[PDB]
Every structure is written in structure tokens, then in C-alpha cells.
């Protein structure tokens, strides 16, 4: 299953 | 650094057009509008992940939104009926899932003009009872009558605003809680020490701005229309 | 920073004349990922030649694989053909049985 | 008989040609199953290995939400490194990152990972904890004390301990007949003379399953691994790897070599002589 | 979907009152509480982080396996009347990251004070007939079923300038014969 990325750097 | 949001009130005759406007300053891309109805939390209208683009939410239908800039997004009611009567929220975030930081939010009452009047104020003066026995004074004002519950009550003792000592009502009460097109009321407190109320050159006043029809609005009525009146009630010291 | 590709050219399965393959051609170790590979068939390009999705090693640089399904020949030469910014002119590397 | 599950991405600016390109492929062990290219006509999670094409219209509406929010979230990043950097926006510029874990056989959860890099160099990486971060730069700092105020190395230690470790199970028993089979390298030499009196024997392994292997040359001292030749494990593209190693011999000396090969599959390391 | 206690919770000033909430989606990625005073805009509390988030008198901790938040307000005060919402973040079933907004519970502080509850009769400055009754320190009520009595909500003052924290409340009546004891 994909990961959830959203944050930014 | 926040989230701006215009009008705070409106007032919509059934088909009527409108459309609120927001901005932001925080530097980011997301920006989000809302709905509150009694009864059930915010619901998504629209919202723009960043410039250029705007996507759908919970609640689309009867609505359309416009991303001007990385600052700005308005959303307008082409055509108002009663179903949209709520209180709007816009609101901001850095992206999708960060904190969204919310707008002051506009009140929208999408009824028949008709409907539309204005406070009818009236202030109270404080009773000898509570005088002897607390030495504290306190006035009462009473803005009766007023559907369009859009008001912001002040005080004003000898001319300048009192933010202390004062206790507005923090919801406007229904006259009917049954009815639907009920008629609202508002009520406030003003506490002085006794002697202040006594010396007869001091000076108080209730002011209840009132938002209802703008000077545009075709008045079709007997009655005087119910513009963005500031009816107001006083007494001096006994 | 930029590192040159490593390039390999072979088949699937150990050459034999007249039996269906695949030549490969396989850049390892580049970086900027973008890359152009054509597999030869004596000198002149494969049109239909595929390639893996790109991917990547523990050290960060890109790999990536481009293959054909071809019948190998005692005396046709097939090659491949990789032009990278990191490279003044496409560098060819011919197909070897023994390699 | 450790695991892994990776996913491996890759974003491309390309200035005066639109929004970056992005791709993303997933990996179990040595074995891509799944891929995501926005260049593609489907804007979709798509297939790569055979197990995982019965997968319901859930996973691949939800799998593909969640690239597709990736690959919005490193065009943004894209954008954010080159102000850090203060960069023109001549050039193109690279965004990897590497995430993934590694259950043991049966064992369970033994380790998380979730990686950045920019234009090739190390940016950001979450340490073995799961709970610091690994700053490679001064304007990786930023970001890594902006994560450190959000706790988000907590929702990718819930992530790297929850959803990866089930969905890697799970992808592991779909896929048993493919995932957990080992195939042990066939083997073979050459022989070619280069000069009249030296010889290159070429050791060669082929068809193996696993990409591990150790191909190690051996004169009568047991290991020369100066003199040796030795190529990178490559794909044959029907899921086996390939490799082999080159020595130069004396002619008439070949028997003083052997060569010795060790891999998995194998119940023990092969000797390999002419 | 996100469910959090019914309420209202009426409770004394000082009390230490807990909030649970509870999300049903298993993937939600970040969660926090919203405090939203009443007729006015929702504002961020404070995050929750399931290692423990604590701020002052308030304090909240996340349960992944229950699925489950709580918010804990130690040494209630009247400032923390509001309604407190429950903010979780989940992808949609698109590539978009949103946050679920709860209905979230209404809480009313009201004051522990003076042993004078009271009404007074106060005279109009114009009229001869309108009259207004109020009330110093409550026994929560709004017991008015006379189909012609009003009744505001009891405000809730916090004076520090004459330190009274003043809990009075407005009633009137169109009738002219309006006892205010008789409302």
C-alpha cells in the first residue's frame, strides 16, 4: 500500500 | 498574518445574486469554503488545492467559486433561495492536510425582503433595590423585533465606547422558538458603581446597528424600508 | 552532480541461431534520469524496442532496461545506442555472445 | 528470509514544458508490482507484476489518490527547493525519494524507511527510530525542524509500522508462487585466449531469483579480488537477474583458478572449474 | 465520518471536563481539537499526537487502535464556554487531503457565586408599561413555559474591574400585567 505524503518541506 | 472575509451579513430577496468574497495573507496555496447549518457541522462548498485550480466539496450544488490569486477566493450564489439561509465560512491552509485557519465567517438569510425589519430598542433603567444593597448599578437595553438577526449592540457612556462592565446577550433569542419566520430579540448589561449612575451629567446609550435591506432594494411596502439602520436607546442618571 | 551511465547489451537467454530471444540493453548509474537508448539491428534503429518504468539504486542513481524481442543470427550484429548530457556523442556498444 | 516492500519516485521539473513529470514504481523485494506515470493517457495506479491485477476497484481508485497527492506534494517541494537553494528556474531539477519496510519471515516489522533527495544528493531521512530526522543540508535543516514541530515522523512510524507491514503481507501471500519462490543461478565458463600466453575465463551465473549474489574469483591463495572483473547484476527481464565475473589466467595455469559462487537458492556455494 | 459526545456539558467553574471523539476512518492521517465560541468563527486548540499533547489546562491523547481522541480541560473557567470540535485528516477517495469537521460539543461554564438570587424590576426611560426583570447568580434554568414570557440564556459575565463574575439574565413581557415574580 502507498504511503500518505502531504507535508511539505 | 490571517484570513479576511466580507460581507459579515446579507440579507437575499428568493433569486437574488451575491457573491462573498475572501482573502488571505498566510502564503498558502489551499483555501476552503464552508457552510454551518443548526444541526450539523461544516460542510465542504468548494475548495482550491492552489492558483489556478478549484475543486468540489459535500455541498456544491447552488454554488461557484473563483481562485483570483494565491490570496483571494470568492464564492457566489447565482441564484439564492431559501435552502442556502446559513452562515458561511471561508477559510485557509497551507495544503491539503495542514490546520486550516478560518475566516470571521458571513451570515446569509436568504428570505423574502418582506420579512426584513428592524430592532426596536428600549433601555431599561436599574432598579433602587439592587442600589442599596450592592452599590453596583445596571442598565438594561432590550432590542426587540428584528428578523434579519444581523445587529452588533454597543454602549456608549458620554460618548465613547465602554468594553467593561458590559454583558451582550451572546445569541439573539427566537420570539418563537417554534416558528420559522420568527422575530428575534437581544438583550444587554452595563454595570457602574451606584454613584456613577446617580450623577445626572453622565450619559448612556444602547446602540444596535442593524443590517438589513441595501438602499438598492425596491421597497414595494406601507412600511419605510428596513436599510442598514442604527436604532438607539438612552437614559441619564436619576 | 552528474554520473555517466554504465551500459550492458545481451540476451535473455545465451544466444543460439534461430531460436526466438530478447536483446537487452540495460544504463545503470546515471543521473540526470533523463536518457535516450535506441537498440541497432545491423547499424540501423529498432522502432519497437520497450523499456522499464524508472527506478533506482541504493546510491540514488537510475537505472532502467530496454529490450526487444529478436532472433539472433550468426552474422547480424545488433548494438545499442545511449546518448546522455553526460556523453559528447551517443555511445554505442556492440552485442557480444560471450560478452 | 527477510522481506521488503519499497516504493521508489521520482519527480522531474522541466521548465517551459509544463508541470513535472512524476514517476513512481513499487517493489517487493527484487520485484516491481506496481507503477505511476503522469505522463500516461490513465492518470492511474497501474499494474506491473501478475498477482497484483485482481486487486478490487478500491485499491486502485484509493492507491492512485494517494500517488496522485504525492506527486502534487513534490511539485510544490520542487518549488520549495528552489527557493531554499535561491535558483534560477532555468534547468531542470530532481526530486527522489525512497520509502518503504522490511518485515522478517514471520518475524514481523523490523524496520521502516522514508528518504529524500534533491538533484542526487541526500536531503532528508527518517533514522531507524522512526522518530528523528536526518538533515543533510542547512536548508534541509529548515525542513527538518518544521517536521520536528508537526510530528510527522509520527505519522510515518504509524505508516512504516501499520500500512506498510499489512500491505506487504498481504502482497506476500498473493504472490507466494512468485514472492517466496528462490531461484538458484545456472552456471557455466568460457574460455577465450586474448593473447598466446594468457587466457580470460569468464565465470558466469544466470536465471537466479534473488538480485544478492557473490561471485568470487580464487587462484591457489583462495581469492584475488584485485585482478578480477566483475559486472553489475542485471535484469534478463522475465524476473531473473543475471552476473558474471572475468579473471585473466596464464595459459596452461586455468586449474590453478576457481571460482566460487554463493546465493540463495544454492543449498551450498557451487566451485566452478574449467 | 467523525462522532464526538452529544452534549451539552454543563458544568460548575474549576471542574476538569474530558471531550471523546471517535473516527471511523482507519487511514485519517492528522487530528486535532477546535474550540468555535458561540456566533463566531471555529479556531485551532491544539494538535493531537497520541505521545501526549498538553497546553496549560488543556491536554488531549490519541488512541490509533481504538480509534478514539479525548480533550481534557483541568480548572474549568467561564472563558472556555464554546463549542469544541473534532478536526480529523483523511485522503478523500481522490487525491485530495481534507479535513473531516465534527459537530462538536457545546460547553457552558457557569459561575459558582453570591448567595442573592434576585429579580429586579427595571423602568423603561420612555415607557410607562414596558418592564424588565433580571436575576444575579443561579440551578440552571430557562423554566419559562408561559406561552408569552421571554427568557434570555443567562449571560455570563467575567468582571475582574469590580471582580464580580455577574451571571444575570433579561425576561419581558408585551402584557401589562407582567409580575416579575409570576414569569
Not at chain 5, 474549576?14 to 487530528?31: P, R
Not at chain 5, 475582574?160 to 401589562?176: I, L
Given at each position: 500500500?502507498?504511503?500518505?505524503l502531504?507535508?511539505?518541506? | 498574518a490571517?484570513?479576511?472575509?466580507?460581507?459579515?451579513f446579507?440579507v437575499?430577496?428568493?433569486?437574488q445574486?451575491?457573491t462573498?468574497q475572501?482573502?488571505?495573507?498566510?502564503?498558502?496555496?489551499?483555501?476552503?469554503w464552508?457552510?454551518?447549518d443548526?444541526?450539523?457541522?461544516l460542510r465542504?462548498?468548494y475548495?482550491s488545492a492552489?492558483?489556478?485550480?478549484?475543486?468540489?466539496?459535500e455541498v456544491?450544488?447552488?454554488?461557484?467559486?473563483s481562485?483570483?490569486?494565491?490570496?483571494?477566493?470568492?464564492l457566489?450564489l447565482?441564484?439564492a433561495?431559501?435552502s442556502?439561509?446559513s452562515?458561511?465560512?471561508?477559510?485557509?491552509?497551507?495544503?491539503?492536510?495542514?490546520?486550516?485557519?478560518?475566516?470571521?465567517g458571513?451570515?446569509?438569510?436568504?428570505?423574502?425582503?418582506?420579512?426584513?425589519?428592524?430592532?426596536?430598542?428600549?433601555?431599561?433603567?436599574?432598579?433602587?433595590?439592587?442600589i442599596?444593597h450592592?452599590?453596583?448599578?445596571?442598565?438594561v437595553?432590550?432590542?426587540?423585533?428584528?428578523?434579519?438577526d444581523?445587529?452588533e449592540?454597543?454602549?456608549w457612556?458620554?460618548?465613547?465606547?465602554?468594553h467593561?462592565?458590559?454583558?451582550?446577550?451572546?445569541?439573539?433569542?427566537?420570539?418563537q422558538?417554534?416558528?420559522?419566520?420568527s422575530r428575534?430579540?437581544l438583550?444587554?448589561?452595563?454595570?457602574?458603581?451606584?454613584?456613577?449612575?446617580?450623577?445626572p451629567?453622565?450619559?448612556?446609550?444602547?446602540?444596535?446597528?442593524?443590517?438589513?435591506?441595501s438602499?438598492?432594494?425596491?421597497?414595494?411596502?406601507?412600511?419605510?424600508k428596513?436599510?442598514?439602520?442604527?436604532?438607539?436607546?438612552?437614559?441619564?442618571?436619576? | 552532480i552528474q554520473?555517466?551511465?554504465?551500459?550492458?547489451?545481451?540476451?535473455?537467454?545465451?544466444?543460439?541461431?534461430?531460436?526466438?530471444?530478447?536483446?537487452?540493453?540495460?544504463?545503470?548509474?546515471?543521473?540526470?534520469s533523463?536518457?535516450?537508448?535506441?537498440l541497432?539491428?545491423?547499424?540501423?534503429?529498432?522502432?519497437?524496442?520497450?523499456?522499464?518504468?524508472?527506478?533506482?539504486?541504493?546510491?540514488?542513481?537510475f537505472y532502467?532496461?530496454?529490450?526487444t524481442?529478436?532472433?539472433?543470427?550468426?552474422?547480424?550484429?545488433?548494438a545499442?545506442?545511449v546518448?546522455?548530457?553526460?556523453?559528447?556523442?551517443?555511445?554505442?556498444?556492440?552485442?557480444?555472445?560471450?560478452? | 528470509?527477510?522481506?521488503?516492500?519499497?516504493?521508489?519516485?521520482?519527480?522531474?521539473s522541466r521548465?517551459?514544458?509544463?508541470?513535472?513529470?512524476?514517476?513512481?514504481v513499487?517493489?517487493?523485494?527484487?520485484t516491481?508490482?506496481?507503477?505511476?506515470?503522469?505522463?500516461?493517457?490513465?492518470?492511474?495506479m497501474?499494474?506491473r507484476?501478475?498477482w497484483?491485477?485482481?486487486?478490487?476497484?478500491?485499491?486502485?481508485?484509493e492507491?492512485?489518490?494517494?500517488?496522485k497527492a504525492?506527486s502534487q506534494?513534490?511539485?510544490?517541494?520542487?518549488?520549495?527547493?528552489?527557493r531554499?537553494?535561491?535558483?534560477?528556474?532555468?534547468?531542470?531539477?530532481?526530486?527522489?525519494?525512497?520509502?518503504?519496510?522490511?518485515?522478517?519471515?514471520?518475524?514481523?516489522?523490523?524496520?521502516?524507511?522514508?528518504?529524500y533527495?534533491?538533484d542526487?544528493?541526500?536531503?532528508?531521512?527518517?533514522?531507524?527510530?522512526?522518530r528523528?530526522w536526518?538533515?543533510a543540508?542547512?536548508?534541509?535543516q529548515?525542513?527538518?525542524?518544521?517536521?520536528?514541530?508537526?510530528?510527522?515522523?509520527?505519522?510515518?512510524r504509524?505508516?512504516?509500522?501499520?500500512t506498510?507491514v499489512?500491505?506487504?503481507?498481504?502482497?506476500?501471500?498473493?504472490?507466494?508462487?512468485?514472492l517466496?519462490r528462490?531461484?538458484?543461478?545456472?552456471?557455466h565458463?568460457?574460455?577465450?585466449?586474448?593473447?598466446?600466453?594468457?587466457?580470460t575465463?569468464?565465470?558466469?551465473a544466470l536465471?537466479?531469483?534473488?538480485?544478492e549474489?557473490?561471485?568470487?574469483?580464487?587462484?591457489?591463495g583462495?581469492?584475488?579480488?584485485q585482478?578480477?572483473?566483475?559486472?553489475?547484476?542485471?535484469?534478463?527481464?522475465?524476473?531473473?537477474?543475471?552476473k558474471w565475473?572475468?579473471?585473466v589466467?596464464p595459459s596452461?595455469?586455468?586449474?590453478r583458478?576457481?571460482?566460487?559462487?554463493?546465493?540463495?537458492?544454492?543449498?551450498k556455494?557451487?566451485?566452478?572449474?574449467? | 465520518?467523525?462522532?464526538?459526545?452529544?452534549?451539552?456539558?454543563?458544568?460548575?467553574?474549576?471542574?476538569?471536563?474530558?471531550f471523546?471523539?471517535?473516527?471511523?476512518?482507519?487511514?485519517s492521517?492528522?487530528?486535532?481539537?477546535?474550540?468555535?465560541?458561540?456566533?463566531?468563527?471555529?479556531?485551532?486548540?491544539?494538535?493531537?499526537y497520541?505521545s501526549?499533547?498538553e497546553?496549560?489546562?488543556?491536554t488531549?491523547?490519541?488512541?490509533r487502535?481504538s480509534?478514539?481522541?479525548?480533550?481534557l480541560?483541568?480548572?474549568?473557567?467561564?472563558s472556555?464556554?464554546?463549542?469544541?470540535?473534532?478536526?480529523?485528516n483523511?485522503?478523500s477517495?481522490?487525491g485530495?487531503?481534507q479535513?473531516?469537521?465534527?459537530?462538536?460539543?457545546?460547553?457552558?461554564?457557569?459561575?459558582?457565586?453570591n448567595?442573592?438570587?434576585?429579580?429586579?424590576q427595571?423602568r423603561?426611560?420612555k415607557?410607562?408599561?414596558?418592564?424588565?426583570?433580571?436575576?444575579?447568580?443561579?440551578?440552571?434554568?430557562?423554566?419559562?413555559?408561559?406561552?408569552?414570557?421571554?427568557?434570555?440564556?443567562?449571560?455570563?459575565?467575567?468582571?475582574?474591574?469590580?471582580?464580580?463574575?455577574?451571571?444575570?439574565?433579561?425576561?419581558w413581557?408585551?402584557?401589562?400585567?407582567?409580575?416579575?415574580?409570576?414569569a
Amino acid at each position: 500500500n502507498y504511503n500518505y505524503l502531504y507535508r511539505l518541506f | 498574518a490571517g484570513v479576511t472575509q466580507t460581507p459579515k451579513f446579507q440579507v437575499l430577496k428568493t433569486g437574488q445574486s451575491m457573491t462573498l468574497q475572501c482573502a488571505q495573507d498566510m502564503n498558502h496555496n489551499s483555501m476552503y469554503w464552508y457552510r454551518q447549518d443548526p444541526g450539523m457541522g461544516l460542510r465542504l462548498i468548494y475548495y482550491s488545492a492552489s492558483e489556478g485550480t478549484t475543486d468540489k466539496g459535500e455541498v456544491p450544488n447552488g454554488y461557484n467559486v473563483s481562485r483570483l490569486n494565491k490570496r483571494e477566493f470568492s464564492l457566489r450564489l447565482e441564484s439564492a433561495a431559501p435552502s442556502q439561509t446559513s452562515v458561511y465560512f471561508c477559510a485557509s491552509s497551507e495544503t491539503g492536510g495542514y490546520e486550516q485557519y478560518f475566516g470571521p465567517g458571513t451570515r446569509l438569510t436568504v428570505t423574502d425582503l418582506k420579512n426584513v425589519f428592524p430592532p426596536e430598542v428600549a433601555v431599561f433603567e436599574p432598579s433602587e433595590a439592587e442600589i442599596s444593597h450592592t452599590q453596583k448599578a445596571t442598565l438594561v437595553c432590550l432590542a426587540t423585533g428584528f428578523y434579519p438577526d444581523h445587529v452588533e449592540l454597543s454602549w456608549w457612556v458620554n460618548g465613547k465606547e465602554v468594553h467593561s462592565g458590559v454583558c451582550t446577550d451572546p445569541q439573539p433569542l427566537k420570539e418563537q422558538p417554534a416558528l420559522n419566520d420568527s422575530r428575534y430579540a437581544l438583550s444587554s448589561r452595563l454595570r457602574v458603581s451606584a454613584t456613577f449612575w446617580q450623577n445626572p451629567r453622565n450619559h448612556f446609550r444602547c446602540q444596535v446597528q442593524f443590517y438589513g435591506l441595501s438602499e438598492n432594494d425596491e421597497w414595494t411596502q406601507d412600511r419605510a424600508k428596513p436599510v442598514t439602520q442604527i436604532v438607539s436607546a438612552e437614559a441619564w442618571g436619576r | 552532480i552528474q554520473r555517466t551511465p554504465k551500459i550492458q547489451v545481451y540476451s535473455r537467454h545465451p544466444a543460439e541461431n534461430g531460436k526466438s530471444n530478447f536483446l537487452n540493453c540495460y544504463v545503470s548509474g546515471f543521473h540526470p534520469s533523463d536518457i535516450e537508448v535506441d537498440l541497432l539491428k545491423n547499424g540501423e534503429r529498432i522502432e519497437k524496442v520497450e523499456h522499464s518504468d524508472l527506478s533506482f539504486s541504493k546510491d540514488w542513481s537510475f537505472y532502467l532496461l530496454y529490450y526487444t524481442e529478436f532472433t539472433p543470427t550468426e552474422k547480424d550484429e545488433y548494438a545499442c545506442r545511449v546518448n546522455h548530457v553526460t556523453l559528447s556523442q551517443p555511445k554505442i556498444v556492440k552485442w557480444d555472445r560471450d560478452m | 528470509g527477510s522481506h521488503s516492500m519499497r516504493y521508489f519516485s521520482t519527480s522531474v521539473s522541466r521548465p517551459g514544458r509544463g508541470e513535472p513529470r512524476f514517476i513512481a514504481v513499487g517493489y517487493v523485494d527484487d520485484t516491481q508490482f506496481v507503477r505511476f506515470d503522469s505522463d500516461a493517457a490513465s492518470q492511474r495506479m497501474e499494474p506491473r507484476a501478475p498477482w497484483i491485477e485482481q486487486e478490487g476497484p478500491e485499491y486502485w481508485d484509493e492507491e492512485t489518490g494517494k500517488v496522485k497527492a504525492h506527486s502534487q506534494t513534490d511539485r510544490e517541494n520542487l518549488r520549495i527547493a528552489l527557493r531554499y537553494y535561491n535558483q534560477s528556474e532555468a534547468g531542470s531539477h530532481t526530486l527522489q525519494m525512497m520509502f518503504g519496510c522490511d518485515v522478517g519471515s514471520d518475524g514481523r516489522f523490523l524496520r521502516g524507511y522514508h528518504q529524500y533527495a534533491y538533484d542526487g544528493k541526500d536531503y532528508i531521512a527518517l533514522k531507524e527510530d522512526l522518530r528523528s530526522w536526518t538533515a543533510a543540508d542547512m536548508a534541509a535543516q529548515i525542513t527538518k525542524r518544521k517536521w520536528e514541530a508537526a510530528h510527522v515522523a509520527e505519522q510515518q512510524r504509524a505508516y512504516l509500522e501499520g500500512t506498510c507491514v499489512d500491505g506487504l503481507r498481504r502482497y506476500l501471500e498473493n504472490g507466494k508462487e512468485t514472492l517466496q519462490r528462490t531461484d538458484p543461478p545456472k552456471t557455466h565458463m568460457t574460455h577465450h585466449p586474448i593473447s598466446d600466453h594468457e587466457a580470460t575465463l569468464r565465470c558466469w551465473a544466470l536465471g537466479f531469483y534473488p538480485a544478492e549474489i557473490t561471485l568470487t574469483w580464487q587462484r591457489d591463495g583462495e581469492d584475488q579480488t584485485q585482478d578480477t572483473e566483475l559486472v553489475e547484476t542485471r535484469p534478463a527481464g522475465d524476473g531473473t537477474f543475471q552476473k558474471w565475473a572475468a579473471v585473466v589466467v596464464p595459459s596452461g595455469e586455468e586449474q590453478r583458478y576457481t571460482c566460487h559462487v554463493q546465493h540463495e537458492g544454492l543449498p551450498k556455494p557451487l566451485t566452478l572449474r574449467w | 465520518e467523525v462522532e464526538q459526545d452529544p452534549g451539552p456539558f454543563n458544568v460548575p467553574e474549576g471542574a476538569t471536563v474530558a471531550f471523546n471523539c471517535t473516527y471511523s476512518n482507519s487511514a485519517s492521517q492528522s487530528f486535532f481539537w477546535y474550540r468555535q465560541d458561540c456566533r463566531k468563527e471555529p479556531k485551532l486548540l491544539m494538535s493531537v499526537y497520541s505521545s501526549g499533547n498538553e497546553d496549560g489546562r488543556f491536554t488531549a491523547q490519541l488512541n490509533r487502535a481504538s480509534q478514539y481522541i479525548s480533550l481534557l480541560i483541568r480548572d474549568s473557567k467561564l472563558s472556555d464556554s464554546a463549542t469544541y470540535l473534532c478536526v480529523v485528516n483523511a485522503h478523500s477517495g481522490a487525491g485530495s487531503y481534507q479535513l473531516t469537521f465534527g459537530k462538536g460539543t457545546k460547553l457552558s461554564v457557569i459561575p459558582i457565586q453570591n448567595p442573592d438570587p434576585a429579580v429586579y424590576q427595571l423602568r423603561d426611560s420612555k415607557s410607562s408599561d414596558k418592564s424588565v426583570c433580571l436575576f444575579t447568580d443561579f440551578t440552571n434554568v430557562s423554566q419559562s413555559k408561559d406561552s408569552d414570557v421571554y427568557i434570555t440564556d443567562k449571560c455570563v459575565l467575567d468582571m475582574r474591574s469590580m471582580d464580580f463574575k455577574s451571571n444575570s439574565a433579561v425576561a419581558w413581557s408585551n402584557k401589562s400585567d407582567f409580575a416579575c415574580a409570576n414569569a
